[PDB]
Design a protein around this nucleic acid. Structure first.
Lengths: 184, 144, 134, 57
RNA sequence: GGAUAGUGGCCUACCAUGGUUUCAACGGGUAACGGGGAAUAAGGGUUCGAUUCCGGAGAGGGAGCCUGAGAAACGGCUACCACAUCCAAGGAAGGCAGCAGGCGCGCAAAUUACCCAAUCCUAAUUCAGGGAGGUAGUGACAAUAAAUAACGAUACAGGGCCCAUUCGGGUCUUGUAAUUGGAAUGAGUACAAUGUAAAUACCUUAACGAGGAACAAUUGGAGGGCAAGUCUGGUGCCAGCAGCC
């Protein structure tokens, strides 16, 4: 048989389900960021767990250890690239202090909300899913994009969408027929 | 010196002592004796199908007073005769007699669920149709 | 034919098969996708090697349209592509019309039947015919 | 004895009260937004209990 | 010494009781193929591993063997045991723990489809074959964001502000509104190009779909554990609920 296709989970359910403090915070988090599920928070906290686990093991090693000198720098560059932690640090500090709010702040759902083209996190999410967004030259519809800090100046509306010319939209096209039908 | 040996060459004593004392654990003993395989009526499986032999009126255990509706069921794979609860209200009229039922445990790992004496199992399907479907009128048992 | 801007990338000289190996990427704004009868002759005029010595495939449309990338290749001659190009591509492009053939189930069953027969089989028909009377 | 009767009693004496027609609630992030603006943006009464489904008194 | 390809009690011709054993021999059990690994984790652990790779074994049960470099081969043979098929009854033919499929078994598991296009193997290394393999069909266990509506006006309830008839209005909105409108796109319907020679399944179209059952979301629960009703009718130790109380 063909070699198995590996797969891995991305989220982790909390140990205690009915926690009033945790339930309130997560639903509070979803409102402020327009997420559809708690799994959208579970994955970010699962992603954060792999990161805190990585830095914790690295930081147990001594200074000038080649493992953390290479792996710590690589983790810094990846996290700085995605903008979760501040770029004016060179001390491997923020990684263990990274909070959940930092990761979903960098998502495209909120990235296009604060860039002024969306006017709401829910409007952005609908805008994201309906393909009226291009990150580089390419149309995306992923609410969780993790903009790499070279694309915030690269965001723009999709050329294959309304407000781009030669494309009014299906509902507009029906009203175009209504304009001629009204006289007739 | 805390009882147990501590010497660097006492690994065998610690190993053998642990082995002997794991037999006082109920779960380890039950697993390594294979009691579920050799004694339990499902033979170690989660579910079993059987034929209803008779409707039952098991009285409730104190301090509750009620008649739990159950069925004697002879399991197909074994021939062992067990008692299965018919859970919901009026579902006894769906599991009347001689039909083929699917049975599951009560969640107590072989004990009594509540004030029902001696009953280990419950009904989940009747003639291939889920008992919850008949109770919620979503499906009906084949008339012919 | 308007702003199709077809171009090739990673052109490598592969003379053992006597061809030019490359990937071809097209930008087709306001267009679904370019077809074979368009891309093949366009690749021919840009290269000026031959007309039917061009082959293209792959051609996944980029998510959300706009452009497409695939693989392409150009031969020194049409008489040289006949010796190398895969048969299914030749039949697809029109360089060959494959005659209808028996299905795999039927082909294998016929091989099972004639493996049951030893010899050519001409004499078997006569003996059966001669013994069919009684 | 006599247990071959009286089963399914209260389910047969319960008066049939049909479901009332209502519009569908938002579903998804829209429903998530509904709870968010039901719990945190209304600060009418968050003093001591923050009742969630309070009945008439 | 014989046999073996070869070592060897592997087997054949003798003494000595030689060999193993509480550091567990030898027996018994295994719902035991071993391992790479899996699940679960503070650290140590516990449980699992038929199964994508490696090794072993087997071809219904045993046994024996031919050919061949290599088999004690089973889509090779021979025999017995069990089963079992076609016979004008004298005979003949076996073997899906390959694929698809069927019956039984059970809680439990898919198509008697298309192909060698890819991967690679075999042959007379130079157009063949390949249920190996791939592709499609079934498949909501396992995994990956993924739609089930988004924006604006329009009567007051008041986390708050300018002025003092503090109910004389507010760029300022949080929402009951079955009051609308200028919105946006997807589920997807192939003789159109892109892959298998026959076709399918994200894009774009001489062309299409959305204003409420519309084109809604279900499954569980609301005493506590464990977030969520001393709200309303019905039953009345009954029916029933209740993992535990």
């Amino acid at each position: 048989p063909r070699a198995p296709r590996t797969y891995s989970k991305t989220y982790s359910t909390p140990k205690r389900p009915y926690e009033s403090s945790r339930l309130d915070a997560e639903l509070k988090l979803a409102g402020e960021f327009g997420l559809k599920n708690k799994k959208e928070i579970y994955r970010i906290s699962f992603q954060l767990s792999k990161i805190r686990r990585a830095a914790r093991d690295l930081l147990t090693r001594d200074e000038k250890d080649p493992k953390r000198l290479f792996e710590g720098n690589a983790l810094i560059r990846r996290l700085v690239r995605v903008g979760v932690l501040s770029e004016d640090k060179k001390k491997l500090d923020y990684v263990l202090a990274l909070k959940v709010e930092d990761f979903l702040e960098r998502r495209l759902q909120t990235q296009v909300y604060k860039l002024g083209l969306a006017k709401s996190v829910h409007h952005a999410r609908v805008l994201i899913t309906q393909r009226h967004i291009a990150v580089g030259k390419q149309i995306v519809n992923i609410p969780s994009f993790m903009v790499r800090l070279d694309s915030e100046k690269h965001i723009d509306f999709a050329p294959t969408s309304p407000f781009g010319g030669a494309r009014p939209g299906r509902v507009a096209r029906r009203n175009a027929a209504r304009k001629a039908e009204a006289s007739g | 010196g805390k009882g147990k040996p501590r010497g660097l060459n006492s690994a065998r004593k610690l190993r053998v002592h642990r082995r002997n004392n794991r037999w006082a654990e109920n779960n380890y003993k039950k697993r390594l004796l294979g009691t579920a395989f050799k004694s339990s009526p499902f033979g170690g499986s989660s579910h079993a199908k059987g034929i209803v032999l008779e409707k039952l009126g098991i009285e409730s255990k104190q301090p509750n007073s009620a008649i739990r509706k159950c069925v004697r069921v002879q399991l197909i794979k074994n021939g062992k005769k067990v008692t299965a609860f018919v859970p919901n209200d009026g579902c006894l009229n769906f599991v009347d007699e001689n039909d083929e039922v699917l049975l599951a445990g009560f969640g107590r790992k072989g004990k009594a669920k509540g004030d029902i004496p001696g009953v280990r199992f419950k009904v989940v399907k009747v003639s291939g149709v889920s008992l919850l479907a008949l109770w919620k009128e979503k499906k009906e048992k084949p008339r012919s | 034919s308007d702003a199709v801007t077809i171009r090739t990338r990673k052109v490598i000289s592969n003379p053992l098969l006597a061809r030019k190996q490359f990937v071809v990427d097209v930008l087709h704004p306001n267009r679904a996708n370019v077809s074979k009868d368009e891309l093949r002759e366009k690749l021919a005029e840009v290269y000026k090697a031959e007309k039917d010595a061009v082959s293209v495939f792959g051609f996944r449309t980029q998510f959300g349209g706009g452009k497409s990338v695939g693989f392409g290749l150009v031969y020194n001659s049409v008489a040289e592509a006949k010796k190398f190009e895969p048969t299914y591509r030749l039949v697809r492009y029109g360089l060959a019309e494959k005659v209808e053939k028996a299905s795999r189930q039927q082909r294998k069953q016929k091989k099972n039947r004639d493996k049951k027969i030893f010899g050519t089989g001409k004499r078997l028909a006569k003996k059966v015919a001669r013994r069919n009377a009684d | 004895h006599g247990s071959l009767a009286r089963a399914g009693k209260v389910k047969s004496q319960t008066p049939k009260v049909e479901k009332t027609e209502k519009p569908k609630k938002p579903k998804g992030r829209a429903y998530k937004r509904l709870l968010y603006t039901r719990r945190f943006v209304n600060v009418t009464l968050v003093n001591g209990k923050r009742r969630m489904n309070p009945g008439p008194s």
